Amino acid sequence: GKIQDSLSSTASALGKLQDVVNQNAQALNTLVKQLSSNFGAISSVLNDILSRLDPPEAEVQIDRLITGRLQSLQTYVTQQLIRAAEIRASANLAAT
Amino acid sequence: ILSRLDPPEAEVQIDRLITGRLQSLQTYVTQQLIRAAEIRASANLAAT
Amino acid sequence: CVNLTTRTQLPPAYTNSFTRGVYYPDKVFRSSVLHSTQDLFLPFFSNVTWFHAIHVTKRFDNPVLPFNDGVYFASTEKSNIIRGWIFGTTLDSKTQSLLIVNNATNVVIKVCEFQFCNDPFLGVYYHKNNKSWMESEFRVYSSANNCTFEYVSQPFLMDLEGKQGNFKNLREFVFKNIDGYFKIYSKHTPINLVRDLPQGFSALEPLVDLPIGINITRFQTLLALHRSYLTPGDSSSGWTAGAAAYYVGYLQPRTFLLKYNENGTITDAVDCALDPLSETKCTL
Amino acid sequence: AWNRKRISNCVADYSVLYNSASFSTFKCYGVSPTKLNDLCFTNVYADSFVIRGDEVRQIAPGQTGKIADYNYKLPDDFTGCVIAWNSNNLDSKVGGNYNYLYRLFRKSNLKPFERDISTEIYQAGSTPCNGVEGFNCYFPLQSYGFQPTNGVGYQPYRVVVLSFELLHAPATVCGPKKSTNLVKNKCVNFNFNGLTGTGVLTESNKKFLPFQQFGRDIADTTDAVRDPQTLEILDITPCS
Amino acid sequence: KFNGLTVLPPLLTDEMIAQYTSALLAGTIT
Ligand SMILES: *[C@@H]1O[C@H](CO)[C@@H](O)[C@H](O)[C@H]1NC(C)=O
Ligand SMILES: *[C@@H]1O[C@H](CO)[C@@H](O)[C@H](O)[C@H]1NC(C)=O
Ligand SMILES: *[C@@H]1O[C@H](CO)[C@@H](O)[C@H](O)[C@H]1NC(C)=O
Incomplete structure (x- = not known):
């Protein structure tokens, strides 16, 4: 009975679990936002850059974006793997 | 580098150093996490 | 130029205005999202x-006031005694300057090399x-x-009463100069019976944008002289102006976390820079 | 004291400028010259002045010249196109022309997109001139040498700088395109006043206040737009 | 489909997970 009361009265029980939920959500959100960042480019939106730049110039700016965007993706995947491995351990422990 | 160079043409060298240094941090930051994860398992094994 | 006589000299009265004149930073509409803009x-x-005023x-004062980026003007009027404004650098009629009238037709504006008198005003007689x-x-x-720019704003109407009373209404404006553009923001608040600026949150809505290159160091306000039969009957002493009140607050670069409502009205805002607490909110 | 004009609320075709090709130099930064029409922009500005051919290189982003660092300096983030072309015949007079002036000396570097209207003689260190203008004290003005006899290399060039900023407000500086009737509930490509995005278009419940022209979500991506001609508000979503 | 990032559905639904958990609990008592 007490446990039912404890669970309804606070979010602290799911804090250990919830921290994982929130932390994953925050990581995804940052990366998504990354899209907005220029990364040294003339403009953040990819289409806008292509529309106003001739192919050779557009080539360079595209490359810049990709390098900036490639790095962003790499961080996410690298970040995700570490978290995935951490979650995997819990599941084994979780499964245990 | 800043004293020697103006901002206008400054950026090409200022931009790069920044890119290179960012790399150092990411490697170090990524390295720390892997190391931290190893320690955490050890801590949890040690706690067990 | 014509002058006015018997003025009373006193130290400036001070008050604390809190969380007033937050103006929609730009044109975007956002719903239920918290945004931080460095404006x-x-x-x-x-x-x-x-x-x-x-x-x-024998009290009547409307002298020149220093102007920085934050030219926030918040007049409070009843029988509509404060009407216009003056902008400029030196008001020498040699440097390009700004000037307005608040007529029943429009807030009429010009950019023109005008030669102002030492004591300009608006005159009304009964x-x-x-x-x-x-x-x-x-x-x-x-x-x-x-005059490189001439201009007329949107139509509106004014009451122009000749009576005495508490200032039922409220008017706020934020004059700003950025990247070769002159801008203004406004709100009418029907606040009741508060001498000080009302506690609460209201957001100014941009009214007009003008592209101008004029550089203006300081600004002045326009008064409505309430000329009557009891007055002497001349431009130097014949006036019974009565009550008027206006407050000026400067604007400095700060970061505001602005809460956006579902509709998009900015219901609430917290200043991150103003307090140590506040700074935490921006990071958070 | 360069002349600046603000052009807005109208439709300009850049093909004639690009198309005419009567100008010696048409350098373009951040904008494809051929692709100019398709793109749409707000708050376009025009720069007017005449400098010699040798200094034409100096008037560019991140470059150094007496006039560039002392009279008119382009910003690093400039996204504008500057057009140059000789008018030797116009600048050749029997009497000679010398109403065109450039500053020699100034205490500090002129700021980007700013003009110094102050008239004074530059002063260096001690022995202040106070209008004396002898040795080591110099008057602000300096004239030119444009003459018909004078060589082409240093002959006058007429230089105009075109500068524009895009995606801030609804833009009326839009190009040539004949509009088309709006299409709804069907995945199709769309462009609104120089803004390009592709998604399903549907009548939007969201109510927009008069000043606003765009809507956004939590991720700061386009969520809603108003067709300028129609006055309606609509929601954009990825088709699939 | 939000902006090129897609959250795939879980292989096991929440309801299905509850049955497994319920089964283990049911098994333990009986
Ligand atoms: C405002 O000015 C008054 C002058 O009496 C002074 O007492 C007070 O400390 C000032 N407060 C701020 C925040 O400047
Ligand atoms: C603006 O006017 C002030 C008057 O004090 C002057 O000092 C300053 O140089 C002017 N600035 C510009 C950009 O016109
Ligand atoms: C906001 O939208 C709601 C919808 O229920 C409406 O009741 C309310 O009047 C609106 N307020 C404003 C200021 O738009």
């Missing part, structure tokens, strides 16, 4: 220099033959040389 704002709980004895308030001396300026 000039009146600092919260910023010091505000109150002013008086009320005879209640005639016995017909009960209406007419302009008596519109000698605000001598002429104009070059």
Whole structure:
């Protein structure tokens, strides 16, 4: 009975679990936002850059974006793997 | 580098150093996490 | 130029204006999202220099005030006594300058090299033959040389009452100069019976944008002289202006976290820079 | 004291400028010259002045010249196109022309997109001139040498700088395109006043206040737009 | 489909997970 009361009265029980939920959500959100960042480019939106730049110039700016965007993706995947491995351990422990 | 160079043409060298240094941090930051994860398992094994 | 006599000299009254004149930073609409924009704002709980344009004895003052980025003007009027504004650098009729009238038609504006008098004003008289308030001396300026910009705003209406009373209404404006563009923001608040700026949150809505290159160091305000039969009957002493009140607060670059409602009205905002607490919110 | 004009609320075709090709130099930064029409922009500005051919290189982003660092300096983030072309015949007079002036000396570097209207003689260190203008004290003005006899290399060039900023407000500086009737509930490509995005278009419940022209979500991506001609508000979503 | 990032559905639904958990609990008591 007490446990039912404890669970309804606070979010602290799911804090250990919830921290994982929130932390994953925050990581995804940052990366998504990354899209907005220029990364040294003339403009953040990819289409806008292509529309106003001739192919050779557009080539360079595209490359810049990709390098900036490639790095962003790499961080996410690298970040995700570490978290995935951490979650995997819990599941084994979780499964245990 | 800043004293020697103006901002206008400054950026090409200022931009790069920044890119290179960012790399150092990411490697170090990524390295720390892997190391931290190893320690955490050890801590949890040690706690067990 | 014509002058005015018997003025009272006193130290400026001070009040604290808190969380007032937050103006939609730009054109975007957002719903239920918290956004941080690094756009000039009146600092919260910023010091505000109150002013008086009320005879209640022989008191009448409307002198030049220094102008920075934060030219926030918040007049409070009842019978509509404060009307216009003056902008410029030196008001020499040699440097390009700004100037307005608040007529029943429009907030009429010009950019023109106007030669202003030492004591400009708007004049209204109470005639016995017909009960209406007419302009008596519109000698605000001598002429104009070059005007690269002329302009008329949207139509609206004004009450123009000749009575005495508490200031039922409220008017706020934020004059700003950025990247070769002159801008203005406004709100009418029907606040009741508060001497100080009302506690609460209201957001100014941009009214007009003008592209101008004029550089203006300082600004002035326009008063409506309430000329009557009891007055001596001249431009130097014949006036019974009565009550008027306006407050000026400067604007400095600050970061505001602005809460956006579902509709998009900015219901609430917290200043991150103003307090140690506040700074945490921006990071958070 | 360069002349600046603000052009807005109208439709300009850049093909004639690009198309005419009567100008010696048409350098373009951040904008494809051929692709100019398709793109749409707000707050376009025009720069007017005449400098010699040798200094034409100096008037560019991140470059150094007496006039560039002392009279008119382009910003690093400039996204504008500057057009140059000789008018030797116009600048050749029997009497000679010398109403065109450039500053020699100034205490500090002129700021980007700013003009110094102050008239004064530059002063260096001690022995202040106070209008004396002898040795080591110099008057602000300096004239030119444009003459018909004078060589082409240093002959006058007429230089105009075109500068524009895009995606801030609804833009009326839009190009040539004949509009088309709006299409709804069907995945199709769309462009609104120089803004390009592709998604399903549907009548939007969201009510927009008069000043606003765009809507956004939590991720700061386009969520809603108003067709300028129609006055309606609509929601954009990825088709699939 | 929000902006090129897709959250795939879980292989096991929440309801299905509850049955497994319920089964283990049911098994333990009986
Ligand atoms: C405002 O000015 C008054 C002058 O009496 C002073 O007492 C007060 O400390 C000032 N406050 C701020 C925030 O400047
Ligand atoms: C603006 O006017 C002030 C008057 O004090 C002057 O000092 C300053 O140089 C002017 N600045 C510009 C950009 O016109
Ligand atoms: C906001 O939208 C709601 C919808 O229920 C409406 O009731 C309310 O009047 C609106 N307020 C404003 C200021 O738009």
